[PDB]
Amino acid sequence: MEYRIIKSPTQGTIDILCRADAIGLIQGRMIEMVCAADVAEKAVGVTVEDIRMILLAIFGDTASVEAAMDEIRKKETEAGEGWL
Amino acid sequence: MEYRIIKSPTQGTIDILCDAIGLIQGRMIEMVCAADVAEKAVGVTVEDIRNMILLAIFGDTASVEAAMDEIRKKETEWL
Amino acid sequence: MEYRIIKSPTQGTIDILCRADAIGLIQGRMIEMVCAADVAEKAVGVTVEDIRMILLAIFGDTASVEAAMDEIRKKETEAGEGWL
Amino acid sequence: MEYRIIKSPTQGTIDILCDAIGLIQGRMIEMVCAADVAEKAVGVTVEDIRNMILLAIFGDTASVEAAMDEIRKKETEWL
Amino acid sequence: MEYRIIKSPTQGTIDILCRADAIGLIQGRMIEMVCAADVAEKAVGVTVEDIRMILLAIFGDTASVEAAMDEIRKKETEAGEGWL
Amino acid sequence: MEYRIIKSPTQGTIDILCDAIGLIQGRMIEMVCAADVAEKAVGVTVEDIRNMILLAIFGDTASVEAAMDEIRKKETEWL
Incomplete structure (x- = not known):
């Protein structure tokens, strides 16, 4: 997956997305995005938007957005027991 | 084919799609075949996520895992 | 081309397709599918559906469906005289 | 470019598209060029199968084969 | 980019495009096509059509069409000063 | 990412899209990030060319070139 964060987005940026301190x-x-959406929906301080599905957008304060992104990335790697 | 399971999905997750998914x-072609195995599996509801993009299987964890196993087994089975 | 057969399809499977003993x-x-559709239309015991075109679905009894699939595959290989 | 001919098509085949096709x-770009050669060819009717996906050429076998040959010749013809 | 010219197009060819001595x-x-469209709009003797954007069609007399095509191709190569 | 500039665009060019573009x-994902840099850049107007296909930045040459430089710099910036 590709991951990016936009800090202090302009209204124009939000308008492009929907046509927040952080995005x-x-x-x-x-399949990966639907899984990620679930982690983000269970994360505190964030709002989740499915961009139509092409992209997943997470809105909130920087700290909450960064914490939700870290959780999504951690769950994506899925290096569980018996992985070999 | 890619296989994933979501345990205890939120309503928001279900909304994006529309106790385990x-x-x-x-x-x-692969997904239509998989949909048939899932429709014949006990304890699961099948949803074609649409031009069909993804196959979603709803139910209790045990039933969902059993249906996923049968789909995967039927896909991977000759010289 | 990819070839598959579904034996004793459920109504749900038929519903996914259309949104038969065998499919x-x-x-x-x-171009390949339009050619295949012609072989299937000339085959006894089968009904042909163009799934919209993404996929070609052939409906009927197992024997007729298998015979139509074999014919399509045989015509597809096209190892005619002077092929080199 | 891919080239195929259907001899004595059924009505069902013609229905999917819409004595030789x-x-x-x-x-x-290649298909628009091919369509021009086919429109200039004797004994054939040209149909753009649509965002254009495929080019269909209708007529008697001899005319269809002759139009296909001219399309292929014009496509493959310098240092 | 791919470049082609159709000399003395039939009405049917024009109909396929729009659904001229040269095309x-x-x-x-x-991005490449929008740049090319600008060169073509600044070229004498030609009309420009964006085929929907999938393709760019230039209409006019052969000489004007060939001159506009040459200009587009020349601007596309962009081997300017300091290119290394 | 691909970057291009059109100096003194014609009305026809602007029509295809909708003193420098x-x-x-x-x-x-890259384009939404780039759109934010462009919206924060002085002397430019931002247009998402649409399902977003392309990003167009309008203004005087100097402002357009400066906004392009900042987009490119932000994209290419660790071990």
């Missing part, structure tokens, strides 16, 4: 962006295959 | 992504 | 499925490039 | 698939 | 055709990525 | 093409 976390995640792009991938739909 | 099994997700399967592949080529349409 | 023969063929996926390929449109 | 010549089919040509390629990039749009 | 210049240019296919590429949108 | 800066064009940036890339993946949506």
